[PDB]
């Protein structure tokens, strides 16, 4: 089920990043390429990211600024942050934080004319999700559970 789920995880990442890019006027296309339908997982993740970024904006903005990104250091910075994020374990809130962090990195990369990073950040997120989070996700009910526990019927 690994890569039955690995194509799906890739699509979740692309959809979240495409949505965060679109909120600022950018587009994903410019920089490259169980019971609840995947459109609901996508929307619940979009929703959760929005509520996370809204409620923790200052703490989250301050933290996104403290790591000075360059195309030659971005990969190491991303992996180090994510290692620390999940050091003590995984819960759905940290996965939401993981997605919002990646989206924030994509948007900042475009702002600062580091657009080569946009598609790579997606690859790193999907690889980490597929290689290091999907076991927990599978063990914890799959994405059905995320929507059931954090879904909201107001978009």
């Amino acid at each position: 089920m690994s890569m039955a789920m690995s194509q799906s995880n890739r699509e979740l990442v692309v959809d979240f990043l495409s949505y965060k890019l679109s909120q600022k006027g950018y587009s994903w296309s410019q920089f490259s390429d169980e019971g609840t339908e995947s459109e609901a997982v996508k929307q619940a993740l979009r929703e959760a990211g929005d509520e996370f970024e809204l409620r923790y904006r200052r703490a989250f903005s301050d933290l996104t600024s403290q790591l000075h990104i360059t195309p030659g250091t971005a990969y190491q910075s991303f992996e180090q942050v994510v290692n620390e994020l999940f050091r003590d374990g995984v819960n759905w809130g940290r996965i939401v934080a993981f997605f919002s962090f990646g989206g924030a990195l994509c948007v900042e990369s475009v702002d600062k004319e580091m657009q080569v990073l946009v598609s790579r950040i997606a690859a790193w997120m999907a690889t980490y999700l597929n290689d290091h989070l999907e076991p927990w996700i599978q063990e914890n009910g799959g994405w059905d559970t995320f929507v059931e526990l954090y879904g909201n019927n107001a978009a």
Partner: peptide, 24 residues
């Protein structure tokens, strides 16, 4: 160091999120 601290506050926020916006 920036990354380790950035990761820890992200974890803090995610844990707050997971409690706040739980609906079941």
């Amino acid at each position: 160091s920036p990354t380790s601290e950035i990761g820890r506050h992200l974890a803090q926020l995610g844990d707050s999120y997971s409690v706040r916006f739980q609906n079941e």
